[PDB]
Every structure is written in C-alpha cells, then in structure tokens.
Amino acid sequence: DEEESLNEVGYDDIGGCRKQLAQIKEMVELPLRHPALFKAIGVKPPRGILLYGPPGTGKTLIARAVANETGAFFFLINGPEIMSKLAGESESNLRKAFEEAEKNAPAIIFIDELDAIAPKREKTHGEVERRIVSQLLTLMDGLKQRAHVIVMAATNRPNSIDPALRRFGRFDREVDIGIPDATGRLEILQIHTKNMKLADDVDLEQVANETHGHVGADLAALCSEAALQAIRKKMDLIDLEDETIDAEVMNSLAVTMDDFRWALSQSNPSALRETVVEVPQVTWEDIGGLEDVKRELQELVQYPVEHPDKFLKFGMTPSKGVLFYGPPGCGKTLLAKAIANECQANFISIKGPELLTMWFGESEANVREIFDKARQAAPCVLFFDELDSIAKARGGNIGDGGGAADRVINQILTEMDGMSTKKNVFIIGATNRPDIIDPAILRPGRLDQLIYIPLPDEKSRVAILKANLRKSPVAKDVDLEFLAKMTNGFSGADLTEICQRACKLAIRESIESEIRRERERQTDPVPEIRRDHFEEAMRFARRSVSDNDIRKYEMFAQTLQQSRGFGSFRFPS
Amino acid sequence: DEEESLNEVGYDDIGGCRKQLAQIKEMVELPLRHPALFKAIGVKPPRGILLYGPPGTGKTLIARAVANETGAFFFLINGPEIMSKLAGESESNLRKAFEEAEKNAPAIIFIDELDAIAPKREKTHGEVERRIVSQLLTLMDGLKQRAHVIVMAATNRPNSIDPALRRFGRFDREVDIGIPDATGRLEILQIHTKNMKLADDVDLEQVANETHGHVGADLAALCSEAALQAIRKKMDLIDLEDETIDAEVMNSLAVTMDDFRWALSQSNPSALRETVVEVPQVTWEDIGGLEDVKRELQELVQYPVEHPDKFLKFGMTPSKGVLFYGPPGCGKTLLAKAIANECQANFISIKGPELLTMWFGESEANVREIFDKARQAAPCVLFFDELDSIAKARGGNIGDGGGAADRVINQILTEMDGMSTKKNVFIIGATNRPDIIDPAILRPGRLDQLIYIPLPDEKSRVAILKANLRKSPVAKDVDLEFLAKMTNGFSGADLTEICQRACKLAIRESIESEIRRERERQTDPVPEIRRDHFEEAMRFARRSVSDNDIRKYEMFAQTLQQSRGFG
Amino acid sequence: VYLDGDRTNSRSTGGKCGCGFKHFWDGKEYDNLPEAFPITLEWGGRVVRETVYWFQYESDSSLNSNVYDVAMKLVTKHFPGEFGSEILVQKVVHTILHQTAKKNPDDYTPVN
Ligand SMILES: Nc1ncnc2c1ncn2[C@@H]1O[C@H](COP(=O)(O)OP(=O)(O)NP(=O)(O)O)[C@@H](O)[C@H]1O
Ligand SMILES: Nc1ncnc2c1ncn2[C@@H]1O[C@H](COP(=O)(O)OP(=O)(O)NP(=O)(O)O)[C@@H](O)[C@H]1O
Ligand SMILES: Nc1ncnc2c1ncn2[C@@H]1O[C@H](COP(=O)(O)OP(=O)(O)O)[C@@H](O)[C@H]1O
Ligand SMILES: Nc1ncnc2c1ncn2[C@@H]1O[C@H](COP(=O)(O)OP(=O)(O)O)[C@@H](O)[C@H]1O
C-alpha cells in the first residue's frame, strides 16, 4: 500500500557532504534546541542561512532530511509555486506562512528557490515582483528573536539574488555545497546501489575513480542506465512486453561490471568545465631526484603553517610565492602537486591557455574570481603555468615595440598585493623563458624566490625510469642502469615516451600472436615485456631539449650565482 | 517584557563614530532644545540630513540611539515597508506621518532605506515609483513652514538617490560614516564583549590591530564565531542532544585567545577592496639618514598650515607638489608616510598597478573619484608611485610613435589643476625613470620641487640596520658597524633582505633543534640571533644597482645642477 | 712580458692548437684561441662596429665565455650611463647567441 514511509530521507542518505552537514547541524539545530546556551555567552544566533551549489548537487535533499529529522515545526515554501498565484494572493500566502510559523516554536522555514522570488533588482522587469521582494524584506526584518524562527533558502548561484537580501539581519550565513571528490562519489554510488542486485565482480571503487565531473544526479543516472542495460542484455529475448514477466527471470537479475562500463561510456558529465579543487594524489615517490628542492619547498610552505609562534618570536614575514624556471618537461608541475599533497591543502591549477583566453577575450576581471575561489579554500596552493605565454605571444625577443607589461599580469599583481596575510594561499609560477618575464613580478612581497630545475643526472634518470614503470609488468632481466647510462641528455618526458613505446610494441606483438594462434586453432605468449622490445623502442628516441638550448639556462644561473660575491665576509672577533 | 526594556540602545553603544556623532548631535539637538538661539544669530536650522557609508557601519543604529536621547518625538519610516504596501495606500501612508509629526512637538522623521523608495529616475521604469518620489519631494518642500521638524535619511551610497533629493532644502546636509580605524575597531570590540565572559590571556589590542578591513558588522560576526568555536572546542564533548545543560558547565565557559585566532582565520572582511584613509603609523625613527630631506619636506607641508599668517603677509603661495626620483628602493615611500604622520593628516596611496589598470580598462574617469576622497578627508597627502609605469609600458624612450602623453596622466593633471588652496591636499609623486616622465607634470603649480634620493652612505647604513633590527632579539656580539663598512653600495632593500635571511636561518635552526629534542621523550637552544647567522646570510647577498645605474643618476643630477648656475 | 697568444712555457692541456703551450689573451693565460664575430650597435642614433671574441672550448669551466657578461661589457664600454640600455643588452645577447651556434662540431676557426 502506502509503504513510502520506508523510503525517506535521513542523514545517512546524504553522502559526500559531511562538513556542510556538520555546519547545518551547528547553526540550525543547536540555536533552537538549547536557547539558553547562546544566552549564557550572549551572542545572537543567525537569522538566515543560504545554500550555494551547482545544479543537481543535493540542495533539496538536505531540506527534506532536516524536515523529517528535526522534530521542530517545519514549513516548506516553494519558489515557483508562490509566484504562480494571482497578484495579491501570493503576498497573502507568504504572510500567512510567516505568521503561522511564528505561532509555533521552533519554526524552521525553508524557501526552495528564491532566485525566482527575489531576482536582481535591476532585472526585475515589472512592478509586482519588486512588491514581492519588498514584502519579503519587511517580514524578514520583523523577526526580533520571536519564538526562535530560522529561515533557510537555496540557490544555484549567489550572484542572482537582490543584494539587499545579503545584509545584516538577512541571509548572511552561507554554505558552499560543491562538486564531490573521489571518496564522495564512491559513497554516493554505495548509497544508490544499496537496493539493486549486483554481481560478484562489480568493484564500485573503479567506477568512482573513472568518473571525473559527475555529480549526485549524474551518478544516479549512471546507475539507472546500468540497470537498463542489464535488463536489455539477456531478458530482452525472454521478455515479451505482454501479460506479465516470469518471476524466474525477474528475480534472477544481476548487473555486471560490463554493464557499468557501458553505462559509463554513454555518460555526459554536467560539471566538466568547472574548476577542480581537490587534494592532489601525487606523493614524493612519483618524483625522482630533486632532493634539495623538496627541502626548500617544505621550508617555504610547511613551516609557516605549523610553527606560527617561531615566526612571531623573530618578527619575520613569510614568503608568499615561488617561481620555477628551467628546461621544459622536468617536473615543474609534479613538485607543486606533491607539496600541495603533503600539507593536505587544496590545489587550484591555472594553465597557459586559461591565461591566453583572458588576454584575447579582454576579460581580465575574471582573475579576481580566481583569487576569490582560493580565498574560499584556505589553505590552498595556486599554480600558474607558463607565465611567459602572453609575453611569448607578443613577438618574444623582438615584440611589437611595447614594454614588458600586459593586461592580465597587471591584474594578477593588483590582486596579489591586496590579500590578507592571515590566509594561507601560497602562489607558485612556472616559466621556461625566465628572461622575458615581467621584472615587476620579482619585486619583494611577490614571487621573489627563484628556483632552478635542471636536467636530471644519471642517478636521477635511474630513479625516473624505476618510478615510471610501476604499471607495466616488466620482466626482471633488463638493466635500467644501462639505459640511464646511455641516455645522457634526456628529460623526463623522453623517458616516459620510451616506456610508452615499449608498452605499445609489447601490446602489438601480443595481439598479433593471439590472432595468429586463434587462426591456427580454427582448423599468453607475451605476459610481460622482455629485453628486445626496449631495444627496438630505443631506436625511436630523440632528445627533446637540444644541446645548444641549455646554454641559456646554464649561463643565466651562473650569472645569478655570480652576483653573490660576498662569501668571504668574516667578523673580526 | 523585562530584558527588552533595559536592553534599549543608547549613545553609549556607538563605537568609533565620535566626530560624526558630535555633528549629528549638533545639527539636531540644538535646533530643537533651543529654537530661539538660532533666531538670535539669524542662521536658519537645517532641514535634511543624509548618512553615507558602506553596509554594516551602524547607520540605522544611530537612528535608534537618537530616538532615546532626544526625548521630543520620533517617527520611523522604512523603505521596504512603504514599498510593500498596495499602490495608492503607500502614497496615502507617508502623508499621515508628515502630518502626525507635524501635529506634535518638535519631531524627527527617519527614513531608513532611502534608495528603496527614491532610486535614479531614468534608471528605473515604472509608474508608482515616480509617484512615490514626487510625493516625497512635495512633502519635504511643503514642510518649510518651520514646525520644528527635521527629516533624516540613510543610504548605502549617495550616487543612487534621485538627484532631485540632494538640492537645497531637501537633504542638503550630509554625514559620512566611514570605515573604523585601529582605535575604532578596539572600541567596538570592547563594546561588543561587554556581556561575554572571557579569559585573561586575550588582549583586544592585537585583535584590533590584525583585523584590517573589517566594519562593525564584521567585528560582531567575528565575536560570535569566536564564541561558537569556544562552545564547539570543549563543552561539545558533554552536551549531546535532547538533554538539559547543567549550570556547572554553563557558568564555567570562557573564550581564549586561540579561539579568537581561529575565528580571525576563518573570516572574510567585507570592506576590503576600498582605499584606506587613515593616519600612518610610521615616524622619523624608522628612516635612517636623509637629514636634509626631512627639513625640506617639513618646510613644505607643515609650515603652510601652522603659520597661515606668515604666508598671507609675504604673499607666497604654498607648494602643492613634489617629485622623488632615485634608484629603486631607498625610502621614497617611507618619507611620504612619515611626513603624513608628523602633521597628523590622512594618507591615500595609489600604486602603479592601479594606474595601469585605469590605462588598460579605458576608465580614466575613475580619477575624478580619487581626489574627491582626498578632498573630504582634509588635510590629506596623496601619493602616486611609479608615475613612469605607463610610459615604460608603452615602449620607453624612442620605442614607438609617441610623445610622452597618455590618457591617465592627463586626467591627473586636469584634476590637480582644479584644487583649491584653502583645503590642504599635498600631492607627492615617485619615480625611478625621470628621463621618460611627462614634462607637463613638472610645470610649476603642479609638481615643482624635484628631490633626489641617493644611495645611503655609511652612517645612514648604520641607522638603517639599527632601525630594521629593533623588532627581533639580537645578541650583543653582533657588530653592525662592520657590516655597514663592508657593504658599500647596497640600497635600502638589500639590508632588509639580509636581515630576513638571518631570521629565516635562525627559524630553521630552532625548528630543527626542537624536532631533534622531541625524539628522546619516547625513550631554548637559540633564544637570540647569533653572529654566525649573519656570516652565512651575507653569502646570499647581491647589489641591486650596479655602478652604471649610479652613473646614470649622477649624470642626470649633474646636468640639472649645471643648468642651475647662479652666484 | 707576453703580448698575445704566444708559445709560453705554460703547458697547454687539451688545446686544439697542438703546440702544447698555453696562449695569452687580454691579461689571461688560455689554452686555445678565440673566434671573432662582428657586431653592430645603433642605440641612441649613434652606430658603432665591434668585434667579439668567444671562448667555448676550454679545460676549466670557470674560464669559458659568458654571454651576459660579454654583452654587458660591450654595452658599458660604448654606451656608459645611457638610460634604459638593457634593451640593447638583450638584443645583443640574442644576436650573439643565435650567431654563435655549433650545429656541426667542426666550426672551429680561431683567429691567428
Ligand atoms: N549526496 C547525494 N547523495 C545521493 N543522491 C544525491 C546526492 N546529491 C544529489 N543527489 C541526487 O539528486 C537528487 C536531488 O536533486 P538536487 O541534487 O537537490 O538538484 P537541485 O536542482 O540542486 N535541487 P532544487 O533546485 O531544490 O530542485 C536526489 O534525490 C538524488 O537523486
Ligand atoms: N559603531 C558601532 N558600534 C557598535 N556596534 C556597531 C557599530 N557599527 C555597527 N555595529 C554592529 O553591527 C551592526 C550593523 O548593522 P546596521 O546598524 O543595521 O548597519 P547597516 O548595514 O548600515 N543597517 P541599514 O540601515 O539597515 O542598511 C549593528 O547593528 C551593531 O550590532
Ligand atoms: N623528476 C621526475 N620523476 C619522474 N617523472 C618525471 C619527472 N619529471 C618529469 N617527469 C614526467 O613528466 C611528465 C610531466 O611533465 P611536467 O612536469 O608536467 O612537465 P613541465 O615541467 O614542463 O610542466 C610526467 O608524466 C612524469 O612522468
Ligand atoms: N633609509 C631607510 N631607512 C630605513 N629603511 C629603509 C630605508 N630605505 C629603504 N628601507 C627599507 O626598504 C623597504 C622598502 O623600501 P621602499 O621605500 O618601499 O622603496 P621605494 O622607495 O622604491 O618604494 C622598507 O620596508 C624599508 O624598511
């Protein structure tokens, strides 16, 4: 019959959002269940909470969870529903809701979509809409701690509400429900697949890792498509689309890993173009050599965030960014990812094309938004890749006759020189052409530290080769040391290419052998990579960085070192 | 109601607003307490007062405070409350107020959100709104019969009200409630933490210093967040749910300094992207050497204001500007802050990136705003840094088909030429490429004085080293005199770099020693910077400017001196 | 004294001259002989012509010519105290670096 009471929304159904749920419990449940606790200290509880989030993230799920898991009186006001009523009656309904809730206590009020109730004031093309907004403002300011009434609201974007509603005494406290991470996606998948019958080879961890831009709605759609594929696969020739289906085939339904793979193939994530904010999965083991640079990075980033007392004692201002320079493809991004991972701080990457888009599009104001996002994810590491891309585009050594200043780097400087030092937002830049960079960047208070990343040596090449082969099942007979000794002027990318070519040759040989064996039988030869392949793949080896190109970097580093000629300073004593 | 009666706000609850509160008291209480006095002098009392200020600076708080002291009469009008009524009823509402306050004793009428009922005329399309604006204008004009009624209004920003409401007889007077300074934030914190048990370790002075771009609402939110984190930290392990908290853990609840540090860490200030107008905290003690420049700068900004009669007697117009030129980094920025601090005048700083932003964005009209902020906050010092940035970015020297003239410096000159000498607004420019500066700036009457800031000499170097080190412990064996004798060519930033490197080495050693000593527990070595740290730090030292740049600046200065041959 | 590039008593180590003796140049004792390359300068209207000597093959690594110092000396000797002369430094650095390439390891023609 009506067994919908078994299908409800509790705090267990909301997966991947634990911190936000904790905040909601803090500022929506405690104030109206223990009123005297805030009275004893003497602080006023908030009178309005707003919920951010891209579409399909779970904003309305929390509404139902709080509605049926609080015990206090709950009143629901749909956004579009209140606007569909005739003019004059909508105000009557809104006033009736706000008066009826106040009669009871506590009286949590949830407004689903107020972006359809109170849009931007200039965009309110009409007259009744402004009257509705004003009526909302008057009722909200009438809550003088009366019966402990708290108002909640949900929106797809903060920058669509009338700014008058984000003042003191109004919706001023906001939560930032966002894109789930890998663990969140795995938890959501485990929540959704709690009812259907899975097979014994379905590992949801692989599915969670493979999906990149999905949100809760997308994961639900993926599960539905997997179930549909499972139904269509075998029961289609048994099902007849008439009368009733046999109970035997009906009960005996399993969703295999192949169906999930097929469903994942036919998937369209709705958050691909968003900026990824997550802790990198790269550790110090993925990087070979560069031991000293790791120490310097740990000193620069980790010390000021762990021992503030020491810095306060000696009166020193911590550095606020570094600039890497060196030959291309040597690990200038792996270092940033690793240093972000070690300190457990979020990582936001801005690539060269991202900068070039703003220079062409005349939209450098977007730079501000970036520095807002990092400010919302402290502690965070902000990485700028190819800072010289704009300078390289403008002619290079011989430009259009202009100075060493452009539109986007200037905005970056303006925004960097105006951030509070209390926040922990480290800034890292990378450029393989350190001579055409804007000299204004290197001024103190900015990216003033210079670190040189050289080409790897023999031991470091051994380390790189060993690190990159943790996936390929190579036989224990090839001497990687000999390869490192022979390959002298190679960067990391070249060694990775050598490994990729060896793997490709092995795959091709295995496929050909399998096809020939099957053809012969119509009437695992190579389960691992052996020595000969690496020989053949060695013929297609080229040096990415020429021998006449490292002179620039070596001479630049030599001059920068030679400028420091006071190493013989000795006190008389 | 018991607590509500004795919790009514008053004059004592306002924070850093001292001058503004005095002005409001002067413009309201006097024309009502003693109406006859204004008749004796003959000056007519004001009729309208408007309050500026960014959101959450206590604009409506002053309204409630005023409607406790001036016990004559008070009627409150809300913008959204008026606009939420049905059309026709809203217009019929205001009249009642403007007759009720007319029927009774000397009364005050406060309109809370003025911009909610009187926006820009052309920027808003509608019919009822225009009728409301016309009704308000008619009532304010007709209230001229002098029934001892004063109308007050508040808004977030003046450049949103219908300009017809800014004329004479209608909101002519204005009061600006700006962002609090360091002392104001401390006073607001002391006001807020009154009925809130605290611990003895927390000092509010540090909190006031560190919270840079906050306003009153932000400070209240910070205090609330600190209290909430105090609840979460310790008591949250006892009170779970559905129970009643015993008084033993209720009364024994206190807020520590770490809670305030955390609450400060997780706080985004509202009024952060706004120019800071405050008296600097830099005195002559932080600057080494430059003795002649100090006197030449004192006799240019301080004499005209201290002794106006002397200037009037001799008929010499005080200088309005000065230009600093020299190698990159010698204290050019420090001198401006020092001279603004000695005279106790507000300081407004404009850097090179702001000029480049106005040049790229084609928004040179913003300069008209900047001087306005300097005009209201008089006396003031206006500082422009890197005036050559635009010329440098446009190619430099003979780099393109240009003539050293752009769209931003032109606006600066246009606005500076229209400054009245009655208001003391001194303007200081700084550059390190004097050869490419616009010659129109140096014309007399805009920036006449041209001061050369050279590299420090030995005595100045000793003074700089001593001034930059009186913030951290230093062992007595360190001999700064030998360092100053040995450097012989460093600018004013290289010495600071050396000191920073020494402090960094000391921090590294101390942390390493602590980590090493924290290993035997399962089984203050460096209290002050020693003289061996400086020896290591001197290894990573480099000259910022070579002898060639000194040659360039010396040649420029000697050409200027040779041009001036008299005597 | 030694004038320039003479068969001194100091023994050449790995020199390509084959005489086994070091060579003297600009107050210093070198192994091989430098090349020569013409360079034109045109900053500030005035145009000058100069020759640059490049040392690339040598035993000790602290003796090989450094471009950022050679260009700086060339600019300073002919344009002392000129404002904003670093553009000329960058241009001459790029020119000499491009024209000093060693695509094939046989472009060794030292001046007598
Ligand atoms: N954390 C989650 N766990 C499980 N399912 C989720 C989660 N988040 C979202 N969903 C799915 O998304 C549905 C709710 O829609 P939601 O994600 O709130 O879309 P919305 O457009 O943001 N909501 P609204 O604008 O209020 O209609 C749920 O019923 C689930 O199907
Ligand atoms: N000077 C001050 N001293 C003490 N508390 C202050 C001060 N300024 C602001 N506050 C606090 O911060 C709050 C700011 O809100 P409010 O006074 O409504 O400012 P507003 O945004 O200008 N108001 P409105 O007139 O509705 O636009 C006050 O109500 C006090 O709680
Ligand atoms: N030190 C290193 N150890 C291991 N792999 C490296 C190292 N340096 C570069 N790589 C390889 O280079 C690739 C990434 O290059 P990247 O660092 O992004 O180039 P760039 O430094 O130009 O950004 C990775 O696939 C990695 O395998
Ligand atoms: N004469 C000086 N006395 C003390 N400190 C100085 C002096 N000159 C430079 N400094 C130091 O240099 C730092 C920055 O110098 P600044 O004045 O900003 O350079 P510029 O004049 O180019 O703006 C300051 O923090 C200051 O401590």
Q: To the nearest 10°, the Cα dihedral for A502, A504, A510, A512? A: -120
Pairing of strands A151-154, A173-175: unpaired
Q: What is the 3-state secondary structure (H, E, C) of B181-210?
A: CHHHHHHHHHHHCCCCCCCCCCCHHHHHHH
* Whether B393 contacts chain A with CB within 8 A: yes
Give the span between the Cα atoms of B456 and B453, in whole angstroms.
Answer: 9
Give the span between the Cα atoms of C104 and A550, in whole angstroms.
Answer: 16
Residue B561 in domain = no
Atom 17 in ligand 4: which residue has the minimum CA distance? B331
Contact assessment for residue A380 and residue A339, using Cβ atoms and an 8 Å cutoff: no
Residues C5 and C56 both lie in one domain: no
Spell out the residues 6+ positions from residue B65 whose beta carbon is closer than 8 angstroms to its own.
Answer: B9, B10, B11, B13, B14
Residue C63 in domain = yes
Residue A553 in domain = no
Domain that holds residue C14: 1-31
Contact assessment for residue A24 and residue A175, using Cβ atoms and an 8 Å cutoff: yes
A91 CA: distance to closest CA in chain B (Å): 9
- CA A112, A118, A122 angle in degrees (round to 5)? 150
Residues C89 and C52 both lie in one domain: yes
For chain B, the distance separating the N- and C-terminal CA atoms, rounded to the nearest angstrom, is 87
Spell out the residues 6+ positions from residue A306 whose beta carbon is closer than 8 angstroms to its own.
Answer: none
For residue B154, give the ligand 2 atom closest to its CA.
25
Cα(A329) to centroid of ligand 3, in Å?
A: 6
Interface of chain C against chain B, CB under 8 Å? 76, 80-84, 87
Query: And the tokens for A424?
Result: 């922990």
Q: Which chains have 3 or more CB–CB distances shorter than 8 Å to chain A?
A: B, C
Pocket perturbation via mutation, ligand 1, pick of A57, A183, A195 by most ligand atoms within 8 A of CB: A57
Contact assessment for residue A425 and residue A277, using Cβ atoms and an 8 Å cutoff: no
Asked how this structure was determined, the answer is cryo-EM
Residues C95 and C47 both lie in one domain: yes
| 3 state DSSP class of A198 | strand
Report chain B residues whose CB lies below 8 A from the CB of C87: 396
Spell out the residues 6+ positions from residue B232 whose beta carbon is closer than 8 angstroms to its own.
Answer: A26
Contact between A134 and B83 using a beta-carbon 8 Å cutoff: yes
Spell out the residues 6+ positions from residue B482 whose beta carbon is closer than 8 angstroms to its own.
Answer: A571, A572
Pocket perturbation via mutation, ligand 1, pick of A8, A20, A51, A61 by most ligand atoms within 8 A of CB: A61
CATH number at residue A210: 1.10.8.60
Contact assessment for residue A173 and residue A49, using Cβ atoms and an 8 Å cutoff: yes
Give Cα separations from B105 to A84, A352, A421, B71 (angstroms).
48, 71, 55, 10
Residue A201 burial (CB < 10 Å; 0-12/13-18/19+)? exposed
Please report, as a single letter, which amino acid is at residue B425.
V
- Ligand 3 binding pocket includes A465 (Cβ within 6 Å): no
Give the DSSP letter of residue B115. Answer: G
Residues B174 and B190 both lie in one domain: no
Helices (H) then strands (E): counts for chain C: 2, 4
CATH number at residue A74: 3.40.50.300
Chain B residue with minimal CA distance to C82?
B552
Contact between C81 and B548 using a beta-carbon 8 Å cutoff: yes
Residue B234 in domain = yes
Chain A residue with minimal CA distance to C97?
A552
A397 CA: distance to closest CA in chain C (Å): 8
Chain A residue with minimal CA distance to B215?
A168
Residue C2 in domain = yes
Residues B21 and B99 both lie in one domain: yes
Scan residues 541-570 of A and list those with Cβ closer than 8 Å to B. Answer: 563-567, 569-570
Give the span between the Cα atoms of A91 and A135, in whole angstroms.
Answer: 7
Residue C58 burial (CB < 10 Å; 0-12/13-18/19+)? middle
Give the span between the Cα atoms of B185 and B16, in whole angstroms.
Answer: 7
Scan residues 70-109 of A and list those with Cβ closer than 8 Å to B. Answer: 88, 91
Give the span between the Cα atoms of B185 and B57, in whole angstroms.
Answer: 11
Give the span between the Cα atoms of A6 and B229, in whole angstroms.
Answer: 37
Give the span between the Cα atoms of A211 and A209, in whole angstroms.
Answer: 6
Residue A564 in domain = no
Residues C25 and C46 both lie in one domain: no
Residue A560 in domain = no
Cα(A327) to centroid of ligand 3, in Å?
A: 11
Compute the half-sphere exposure of residue C110: CA atoms within 13 Å on the CB side of its CA. 16
B452 CA: distance to closest CA in chain C (Å): 16
Atom 17 in ligand 2: which residue has the minimum CA distance? B58
Residues A173 and A88 both lie in one domain: yes
- Ligand 3 binding pocket includes A279 (Cβ within 6 Å): no
Residue reference for tokens 């208070």 = A445
Chain B residue with minimal CA distance to A365?
B361
Contact assessment for residue B541 and residue B494, using Cβ atoms and an 8 Å cutoff: yes
Give Cα separations from B402 to B58, B396, B397, B398 (angstroms).
51, 9, 9, 8
Residues C85 and C40 both lie in one domain: yes
Cα(C109) to centroid of ligand 2, in Å?
A: 82
Cα(B341) to centroid of ligand 4, in Å?
A: 16
Contact assessment for residue B343 and residue B379, using Cβ atoms and an 8 Å cutoff: yes
Residues A172 and A192 both lie in one domain: no
Q: Which of B274, B305, B327 is the last residue of a domain?
A: B274
Residue C44 in domain = yes
Report chain B residues whose CB lies below 8 A from the CB of A134: 79-81, 83-84, 116
Residues A280 and A252 both lie in one domain: no
Give the span between the Cα atoms of A6 and A4, in whole angstroms.
Answer: 5
Residues B13 and B150 both lie in one domain: yes
Interface of chain B against chain C, CB under 8 Å? 396-397, 433, 435-436, 548, 551-552, 554-556
Residue A572 in domain = no
Pocket perturbation via mutation, ligand 4, pick of B281, B285, B496 by most ligand atoms within 8 A of CB: B496
The residues lining ligand 1, judged by C-beta closer than 6 Å to any ligand atom, are A 14-17, 55-61, 112-113, 154, 188, 191, 216-217, 220
Query: And the tokens for A62?
Result: 């929390």
- CA C85, C87, C88 angle in degrees (round to 5)? 70
Contact assessment for residue B198 and residue B253, using Cβ atoms and an 8 Å cutoff: no
Residues B320 and B373 both lie in one domain: yes
Q: What is the 3-state secondary structure (H, E, C) of A141-159?
A: HCCCCCCCCCEEEECCCCC
Q: Which chains have 3 or more CB–CB distances shorter than 8 Å to chain C?
A: A, B
Residues C10 and C54 both lie in one domain: no
Among A32, A300, A400, A566, pick the best mutation site for testing chain B contact (most B Cβ within 10 A).
Answer: A566
Report chain A residues whose CB lies below 8 A from the CB of C84: none
- Ligand lying nearest the CA atom of residue A337: 3
Q: Which of A274, A305, A337 is the last residue of a domain?
A: A274
For residue B463, give the ligand 4 atom closest to its CA.
3
- Ligand 4 binding pocket includes B337 (Cβ within 6 Å): no
Whether A223 has a binding-site annotation, put simply, is no
Give the span between the Cα atoms of B492 and B539, in whole angstroms.
Answer: 18
- Ligand 3 binding pocket includes A467 (Cβ within 6 Å): yes
Residues A427 and A534 both lie in one domain: no
Strands (E), chain C: 23-25, 28-30, 35-41, 48-54
Among A553, A555, A556, A562, pick the best mutation site for testing chain C contact (most C Cβ within 10 A).
Answer: A555
| Residue B200 CB neighbour total at 10 angstroms | 8
Q: Which of A117, A438, A547 shows the shortest CA–CA distance to B356?
A: A438
Which of B55, B113, B395 is opposite residue A403, by nearest beta carbon? B395
| 3 state DSSP class of A244 | coil
Residues A266 and A334 both lie in one domain: no
- Ligand 4 binding pocket includes B493 (Cβ within 6 Å): yes
Residues B96 and B221 both lie in one domain: no
Query: And the tokens for A294?
Result: 């790791």
Instruction: For chain C, state the CA radius of gyration.
Output: 16
Pairing of strands C28-30, C23-25: antiparallel
Q: Which of B254, B274, B294 is the last residue of a domain?
A: B274
Residues C59 and C47 both lie in one domain: yes
Contact between A558 and C66 using a beta-carbon 8 Å cutoff: yes
- Ligand 4 binding pocket includes B464 (Cβ within 6 Å): yes
- CA A421, A424, A430 angle in degrees (round to 5)? 100
Residues C21 and C60 both lie in one domain: no
Cis peptide before A106 (omega within 30 of 0): yes
Strands (E), A12-106: 48-51, 73-77
Contact assessment for residue A528 and residue A474, using Cβ atoms and an 8 Å cutoff: yes
Residues A242 and A291 both lie in one domain: no
Cis peptide before A46 (omega within 30 of 0): no
The residues lining ligand 2, judged by C-beta closer than 6 Å to any ligand atom, are A 167-168; B 13-17, 55-61, 112, 154, 188, 191, 216-217, 220
Residue A430 burial (CB < 10 Å; 0-12/13-18/19+)? buried
B395 CA: distance to closest CA in chain C (Å): 11
**In chain A, how many domains are there?**
4
In DSSP terms, A425 is beta-bridged to: A380
Residues A72 and A140 both lie in one domain: yes
Spell out the residues 6+ positions from residue B346 whose beta carbon is closer than 8 angstroms to its own.
Answer: B277, B278, B279, B340, B377, B378, B379, B380, B381
Residues C9 and C53 both lie in one domain: no
Among B548, B550, B551, B558, pick the best mutation site for testing chain C contact (most C Cβ within 10 A).
Answer: B548
Residue A28 in domain = yes
Query: And the tokens for A422?
Result: 């209390």
Chain B residue with minimal CA distance to A423?
B265
Give the span between the Cα atoms of C56 and C53, in whole angstroms.
Answer: 10
Whether A334 has a binding-site annotation, put simply, is yes
Contact between A548 and C103 using a beta-carbon 8 Å cutoff: yes
Domain that holds residue A431: 275-456
| 3 state DSSP class of A3 | coil
| Helix H or strand E encompassing B108 | strand B107-111
Cα(C68) to centroid of ligand 3, in Å?
A: 30
Residue B517 burial (CB < 10 Å; 0-12/13-18/19+)? exposed
Pairing of strands A322-325, B74-77: unpaired
**In chain C, how many domains are there?**
2
Query: And the tokens for B198?
Result: 């605290």
Residues C62 and C10 both lie in one domain: no
In DSSP terms, A474 is beta-bridged to: A529
